Amino acid sequence: DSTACKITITVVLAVLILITVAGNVVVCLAVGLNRRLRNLTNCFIVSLAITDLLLGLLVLPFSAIYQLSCKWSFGKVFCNIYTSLDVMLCTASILNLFMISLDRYCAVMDPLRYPVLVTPVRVAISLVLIWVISITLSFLSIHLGWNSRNESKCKVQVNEVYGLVDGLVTFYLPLLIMCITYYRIFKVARDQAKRINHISSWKAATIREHKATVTLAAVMGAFIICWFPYFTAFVYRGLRGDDAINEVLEAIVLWLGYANSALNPILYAALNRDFRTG
Amino acid sequence: NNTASIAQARKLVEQLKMEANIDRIKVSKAAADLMAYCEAHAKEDPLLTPVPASENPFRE
Amino acid sequence: KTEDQRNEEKAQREANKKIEKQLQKDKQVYRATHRLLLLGAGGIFETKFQVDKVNFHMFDVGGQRDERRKWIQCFNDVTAIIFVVASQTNRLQEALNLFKSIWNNRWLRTISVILFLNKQDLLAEKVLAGKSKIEDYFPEFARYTTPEDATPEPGEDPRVTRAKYFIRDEFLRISTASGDGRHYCYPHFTCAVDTENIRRVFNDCRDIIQRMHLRQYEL
Amino acid sequence: SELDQLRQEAEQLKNQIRDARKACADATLSQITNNIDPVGRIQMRTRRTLRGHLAKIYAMHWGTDSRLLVSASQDGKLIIWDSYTTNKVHAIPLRSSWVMTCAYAPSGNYVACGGLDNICSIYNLKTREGNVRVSRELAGHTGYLSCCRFLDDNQIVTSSGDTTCALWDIETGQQTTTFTGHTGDVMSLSLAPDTRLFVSGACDASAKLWDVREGMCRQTFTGHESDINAICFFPNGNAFATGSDDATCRLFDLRADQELMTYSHDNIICGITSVSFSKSGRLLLAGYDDFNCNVWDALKADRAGVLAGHDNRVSCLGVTDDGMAVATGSWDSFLKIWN
Amino acid sequence: QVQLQESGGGLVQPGGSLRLSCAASGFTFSNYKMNWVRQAPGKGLEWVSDISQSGASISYTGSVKGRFTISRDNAKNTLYLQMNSLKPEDTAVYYCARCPAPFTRDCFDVTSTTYAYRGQGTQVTVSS
Ligand SMILES: NCCc1c[nH]cn1
C-alpha cells in the first residue's frame, strides 16, 4: 500500500523504543551513582526501573519487525522463547506497582510504627515471591502446556482455563484492592486541607485544594487505561473461539499496554520530591 | 562594679610595662623569621611537593 | 610474609566482624525512637518514657546560662520542640521575641514547635483587681473581637475567654507569614492540672510525621 | 564618683599601648614577601573513606603514630579506626548522647570525651581483662565542655562555656589552677610545641596567652569583628592563626605585639569553624560552612586549591603529625582521608 | 577594638521630647542590624525597638508606639532615636545593641545579663 502509511509506523515505532530506553536509563544512573538517594524506601522503584529496560532492549525491537514484516523468520525454537519472555517481564512489572501501592498505605496511615514493620529482612522476601510466581506462570506453563492445550504466526496462547487464572491473579484482583487503598489516602489528605486553611483568619489560603485529585487521577488513570482493554480481550478470546476479535484491533490493543512502560519513570520518579531536589 | 574596674586596671597596667616591653621586635625583624623556617624545612613536606607513588602508604 | 604476619591480618578481620554485627543491632533501636527538647524558658536530665510500642527520649537544659546562640545548634535532628510559655515587667513580649529567633534560625528552619500556654491561673481577674495584665502593653487589645468558633467549655466571663484567643493569634502571626510549609505550630491550653498532656504530645507528633510523607508524594 | 575615676584611668592606659604598638609597625608582611615565587596549583583526591557512624560527627584526633584515629558522633559511640587498612579496633558506648569533643594521648593508653554533660571522662585502653572501663570522672565546671588536651599522662587542660579554663589532676581528681578573664564562652584552645604556654579564643572576639606554671594573661590580642571558632599554633612557637564567624582568618604574631596578615575574599560569606597548618608551615587549610574547604598560602595570602566532596557542613579538620594525609569530618558522617 | 558610645539626655518636665545619638567604630556598620535596649530602676532588662540593615523594616514594643521613631544613616555610622510626649514611667538607662552575626535575620543574644557587643548606657529622668 502507500509508502507514506508504512513510514507513519516506522517513526512512531522507533520513538517509542527510544523513549523507553531513555527514561529507564536516566533513573537507573541517578541512583546508580548513589549520592544520598540510596535508602530502604527506594528498592521498589529501582527494581521497577530495571524491569522495562530489559523490556525495551530485549523483546521490544523484535516485535517491531514482525509487525512491519509479514512473517517471523527466526525459527520455531526462538518462537517458543520469545512468547515466554514477554509474559514474564510484564507479570513481574505489573506486580511492582502493587507493592509500591501497599508501601504508601502503611507510611501514611501508620506513621509512628513505620520503621518497625518495613525492614530489610521483610523487603527481600517480597521481591523473591514476585519473581518466583512470575517464572512459574510464564516459563513452566508453555512446556507442560495448559497454555494452548485447547489448540506461521507466533502469538501467545489461551485455553479458557489459563485465561481465568492469569486474568484474576495478575490484573483483576490487584486492581480491586489498589482502588480500595488509594481511596482512603484521598479521603485523608483532603481532610488536612480545610485544617490548614482554618489556622488563620487574616491571611489568604494557599492550599490548592484540588491537588490530591489531579495527582491521584494520573497515577490510577494510566494503570486502568493501558493494561485494562488487553486482559479483557485476552479473556474474551479464551472464553469463546480464537476467531472472535477482528485482527485490526488486537494489534492496536497490544501496543497500548506496552506504552504504559514509557510512562512509568515520569509518574513514579518525577512527582516524588526526592529525585528532583531542585 | 568596683572589683571589675580595679581588676581591669591592674591587667592593663601590667600589660603596658610587660606586654608592650617586647615590642622592640618589628615586622622586619619578625616577618623575616617565618621565611627562614619555611625555606629551610622545604623538602620535607609531602603535601607541598608530590611524593613518589611507591612509598605512599595510602595509595597502595 | 611470616607466620606471625599472616595471623595479624586474620586477627583484625575477625575483630571487625564482631564490631559490625552489634552496630547493625543498634541501628534498629536508633531508628525506632523519637527525640524531643524541653525548652522551658521565656540539672541536665534526660528521661526515657514509653507509650505502648512508641519509645520517646527528651532532653531538658537546666544547667546552662542564658546565652543560647551556641548550644542550641545541637538539636538539629529532633522531632519537635516543646516550648512551655509559663513564668513586674513584660513577660509575654520577652517570650514573644524568643519564639521568632528560633522560628527563623538557619539550622532550625525545618522543625515544628508545640506550644503550652501553662499557668492557667493567669487570668483576667487581675483586670479589675490590682494591676491589669493586658492594659497598656498591647494597645490594640481594645478593638478586638472574639472568633466565631470560640468554645468556652465550663465558661466564664467571656472576658477571660476573649483574652485567651488574643494571645494565641499573636504567636500565629509570626508563624504564618514566614517560610513555606516545612513546619507548623501546635498551640494548646493546659490548665496546669494533670499529666494527660502526654496524650497531646502523642497526638501531635503523629500529625508531624503524617504531613511530612504527604509532601514528598505531592498530596 | 569613685567608680568613674577608675574608668578614666583605663582609657589612658589603652592609648599608650596603642601608641607603642603603632610605633613599631614599620612595614607589612606583603611587602617583604612579594619576591618569592608562588606555589603551583595544588590538587588532592580522596584515598580512604570510613563508614559506620549513624549521626553527625563532632570531633576527631590523630594519634602520635600517624596510623590510629578516634572519632565522636552525636549518637553515643566512639570508634577507633586503622588508617592504612579500613578496620575497627574499638567501639565504646557512652552514658550521654550529646558529646562535643574528643582527644588522644601522647603515649596511647587513654581517651577522653565531653559535652552537655559538663563532665570529662577518661577510658583505659590497656586493660589486662580485655574490655574497656571508665577510669575517672572530673566534675566542677558550670557549663558545656568545648575542648580538652592531654599535657602529661597525669595532667589535662579543659575549657568550658562558663568562660573559664582549668588544669586537672587525674590521680586526685581536683583542679590545681583556674584561669579567669574572658567575658564570653571559650570555644577552643591549642598547646605550644612544649608544655608551658597555650592560647584560647572566645566569643568576645579576643585571644589570650596563658601560663600553666603561674595563672595570668601575658598578652591580650584583638582583631576579628565577631565570635571566634577555631585556633591553631604555628609550627615555630612564635605565632598562631585564628578563624572567626565573619568569613575571615588572621595570622597574629606572638613574637611581637601585633597581627601580620589577613585571608579574606568577597565571594565567601559563611563561617570558618576549622583551621590547621602543614608541616613546613606554608599551607593553611581552613574549613567552611558551605560544605567545602579551601587551601591558602600563609606567606602570600592567595588561594591555591579546594576540597570538594562533602554534602553537608564541615565540622572537624586535622593534619597528620608527620604530614602524610589530611582527615576531614562533616555532618554527613563520612570521614574522608585526603592526600 | 569594638566599641559603642551613647550621648544625649537630661532632666525634662513630664511632657516634651528628647533625642539620642550613638557612635560606632571598628566593624563595618552596613552589614549588621542594630537594636535599642533599655533597663529600669531595678527591674530587669527589656527590648525597645530595632531596625534592619536598610531603613525598610522596623518594630516597636507596643508600650511606646506612635511616640518613638528610629532612623539609620550609613554615612557617619550613627544611630538615632527621637522621642515624643514622654510620661513618668519613661525614666531609665538606655543602651544600644548589635546582633552577633552580620548576614542573619535572627538574633539569639541581643538581651542578656552580660552582652559582649553592647555599650555603656546613659541616664535620663523625667521629673517634675
Ligand atoms: N505480552 C503480552 C501481554 C501478556 C501478559 N500476560 C499475558 N500476555
Coordinates of C-alpha atoms and ligand atoms in Angstrom, one line a residue, chain A residues 55 59 82-83 85-91 137 156-157 162 166 170 227 230-231 234 237 254 258, ligand 1:
Chain A
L55 CA 11.6 -4.9 28.0
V59 CA 11.8 -8.0 23.4
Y82 CA 10.0 -15.0 22.7
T83 CA 6.4 -15.6 23.6
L85 CA 9.9 -13.7 27.9
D86 CA 7.2 -11.1 27.2
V87 CA 4.6 -12.7 29.5
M88 CA 7.2 -13.0 32.3
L89 CA 8.6 -9.4 32.1
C90 CA 5.0 -7.9 32.2
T91 CA 3.9 -10.2 35.1
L137 CA 3.2 -18.7 35.4
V156 CA 0.9 -16.2 23.0
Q157 CA -1.9 -18.8 23.6
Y162 CA -5.4 -20.3 31.7
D166 CA -3.8 -15.4 34.6
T170 CA -2.5 -10.8 37.6
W227 CA -3.4 -2.7 30.9
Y230 CA -5.9 -6.1 26.8
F231 CA -6.8 -8.6 29.5
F234 CA -7.5 -11.8 26.4
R237 CA -10.6 -14.6 23.1
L254 CA -1.5 -5.0 22.4
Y258 CA 3.4 -1.6 26.4
Ligands
LIG1 N1 3.0 -9.6 26.1 C1 1.6 -10.0 26.2 C2 1.0 -9.5 27.5 C3 0.6 -10.6 28.4 C4 0.8 -10.6 29.8 N2 0.4 -11.8 30.1 C5 0.0 -12.5 29.1 N3 0.1 -11.7 28.0

